[PDB]
Each structure stands twice: as structure tokens, then as C-alpha cells.
Amino acid sequence: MENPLQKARILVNQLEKYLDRYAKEYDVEHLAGPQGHLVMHLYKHPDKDMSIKDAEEILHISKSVASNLVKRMEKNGFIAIVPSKTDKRVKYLYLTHLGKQKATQFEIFLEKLHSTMLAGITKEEIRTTKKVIRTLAKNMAMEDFDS
Amino acid sequence: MENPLQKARILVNQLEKYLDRYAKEYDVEHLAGPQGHLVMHLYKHPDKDMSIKDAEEILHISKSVASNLVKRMEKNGFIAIVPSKTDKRVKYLYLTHLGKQKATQFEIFLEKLHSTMLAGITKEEIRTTKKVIRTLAKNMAMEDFDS
Ligand code: HEM
Ligand code: HEM
Ligand SMILES: [Co+2]
Ligand SMILES: [Co+2]
């Protein structure tokens, strides 16, 4: 269709605006991306621990990025960063009272968000749409289908 | 799905790259957007004429933009800009030999492009996909469904 790139970008920009507004309403700002992922990981596996190294592996990111991410999670009060008692070179992450509230709020938000967004759309229609995208991606990438 | 905005943007960026590479191969660079639209309009209605004012109305753009667009079409050698003989305040646009070659090349390109992109996708699947997008747009816009 005419002006393919402008129309697609106008839609994603709209969606970004929607998600940002919805997130603020549920007080789960900054949890839409990587912060959310790690908070929900901590919350759902309290048996286990997560070092900064574990964070890198879990999100497939470099040390420097992982380090920036966890420092900002701490800034936000979601986690405390405490070196290993046995070896003070390993940094372990622990969800705070606030990070735990944020976790239970984020789960609700994602449920309500999907209910709202996906109202009037079937599992079959999703499957169809997903296939058309995948086929489009495959037709216009060729040997570069490593994505 | 996780990282919704990053995944959508990575796909549109890919598509932009594809279209740019495909356009260069068919020598119809700069015709992907507004230039194409006006060249194909000129080519398909040689009976009629197109002023800069007609260009504004046809593309729903302001005078200043229309003026920048046609000056760049002239720079590219697709058109000649010649004031009305009767009234030298009306500017009329005329497709050149080159603009006409470009027009017949652009038509081929769009046919091949769609054949390639839409291979392995049915009219029903398009209709489905279109409905899911429209419903998504409607669910996440509400009163701002003026798009
Ligand atoms: C500059 C790029 C493009 C232009 C100018 C363009 C233009 C058009 C035009 C004019 C039509 C209508 C043709 C007709 O009247 O029969 C059309 C149809 C269509 N385009 Fe595009 N298009 C472009 C890129 C794309 C892309 C990237 C996609 C999808 C990846 C796409 C998907 C379609 C589809 C599905 C149709 C419907 C064809 C039909 O069944 O009639 N187009 N496009
Ligand atoms: C930050 C934003 C979002 C996050 C973190 C996110 C995350 C997720 C997650 C984790 C799932 C899997 C849930 C499960 O295991 O049951 C999921 C499913 C899904 N998401 Fe999202 N999502 C987001 C936004 C969106 C958006 C914007 C759309 C579409 C507009 C969307 C469409 C879907 C769909 C269709 C499913 C499939 C649900 C199913 O049938 O199991 N999501 N999302
Ligand atoms: Co310890
Ligand atoms: Co004249």
C-alpha cells in the first residue's frame, strides 16, 4: 500500500504512547522492558539468586549494559545490590518491598493490557497474522533470515 | 509479546532497507513516495494538466511542501515546470522523456515488488491481517480513532 513505512511508523508511535500512558496509570512505569523482565524473574524464583552475570545471560546483553540496567533498577528502588559474602566480586540482586509491590502490579497490568488490546481478536486470527508477518519477513530478507 | 516496539521497528527498518535496495535495482529511486504518485498521475492523464495547486490538492499537502517536492522532481529531470501562458502565476508540470521512462519502470517495479513480497500469502490472509491491525488500532486509540 502507498506510504508503507510512514503508515507502519505512525501505528508503532501510537502504540508506544498507549503503553506509556497505560503503564503510568498502573504505576509500573520503567517496567515495560528489561527492568520488568528481571523483577518478574526475581519474584518468581525466590529459592534462587541472580548475580549481575546471571542478569547478562538471562537478557543476552553485555556486562556494561547489564551494569547500567541494574544500577537504574537500584535508583528506582526495585532491587538492592549486595556483593557475595564469600567472594566480594560477585554482585547479587534482591527485590525490595517496593520491587515486590511493582512485580504484583506489573502482572495485573500485563493481563489487563492484553485483555484490552486483544478484545475482538481470535486465537486463529493471531495465528494467521503471525504467519503473514513471518512470511513477509522471510520474502524480504532472503539469506539474512537470522532474526 | 515481550519488547513489542523494538521488534516492530526492527521489521520496518528491514523493509525500508529492502525497498531502497529493490528501487535502486529497477532505477526508480526517489519514486517510492510522493514523486512516484505525481509521475504516475501525469503519465496516466496526459489529456489533463497539473498545476502546483493541483499537486497540493492531490497529495493533501501545503503550498511550501508541494513547492519543495516539485522543485526536487525538476532537479531529478522527471518534470519541467512552465508557467501558464495566459497567466504567469499558475505553474504547470509536464513529464519529460525521462520522467516517462521512470513512469513505465515504476509500474513494473511495483508489480514485481508485490509479487515477491506477497508470495505464499492469500487474499483471505491479507483480509484477516488487515482486520487484526484495524481492530488493534481501534482498541488502543479509543476517541482518537481519526487515523
Ligand atoms: C513504496 C512501496 C509501495 C507502494 C507505492 C505500494 C503501492 C501499492 C498500491 C498502489 C497498491 C494498489 C494496487 C492496485 O490498485 O491494484 C498496493 C497494493 C498492495 N500493497 Fe502495496 N505498495 C508498496 C509497498 C508494499 C508493501 C511493503 C507491502 C507489504 C509488505 C504492500 C502490500 C500491498 C498489498 C497487500 C496490496 C494489496 C494488493 C491487492 O490485492 O490489490 N505494499 N500497493
Ligand atoms: C511491554 C509490552 C508487552 C509485554 C511485556 C508483553 C509480554 C507478553 C508476554 C510475556 C506474553 C506471554 C504471556 C503468556 O505466557 O501467557 C505476551 C503474549 C502476547 N502478547 Fe504481549 N506483551 C506486550 C505488549 C503486547 C502488545 C502491544 C501486543 C499486541 C498489540 C501484544 C500481543 C500479545 C499476544 C497476541 C500475545 C499472545 C497471548 C497468548 O495467546 O498466549 N502484546 N505478551
Ligand atoms: Co551472599
Ligand atoms: Co499553458
Author numbering:
A (entry chain A), B (entry chain A): 1 to 147
Authors' description from the paper:
In the present study, we conducted structural and functional analyses of the heme-responsive sensor protein PefR (porphyrin-regulated efflux regulator) from the β-hemolytic bacterium Streptococcus agalactiae, which is the most common cause of life-threatening invasive bacterial infections (e.g., septicemia, pneumonia, and meningitis) during the neonatal period. Therefore, PefR promotes the expression of these heme efflux systems in S. agalactiae in response to the intracellular heme concentration, likely by binding heme.
The crystal structure of holo-PefR was determined at 1.7 Å resolution. The overall dimer structure of holo-PefR is an approximate isosceles triangle with a pseudo twofold symmetry axis. The α2, α5, and α6 helices and the α1 helix from the other subunit of the homodimer compose a hydrophobic heme pocket in the cavity. Heme binding in the hydrophobic pocket formed by the hydrophobic amino acid side chains changes the orientation of each subunit in the dimer, with heme coordination altering the interaction between the α1 helices from each subunit. Several polar interactions form between Arg9 and Asn13 or Glu16 in the other subunit of the dimer upon heme binding. Rigid-body motion of the α1 helix in association with heme accommodation alters the relative orientation of the DNA-binding domain in holo-PefR from the apo form, resulting in a conformational change in the DNA-binding domain (the α2, α3, and α4 helices, and the β1 and β2 strands in the wHTH region). In PefR, the hydrophobic heme pocket, together with the axial ligation of His114 and the nitrogen atom on the main chain of Met1, are responsible for its heme-binding affinity (Kd 610 nM), which is similar to the ferric heme-binding affinity of apo-myoglobin (Kd 600 nM). Apo-PefR bound 1 mol equivalent of ferric heme (protein:heme = 1:1), meaning the holo-PefR binds two hemes per dimer.
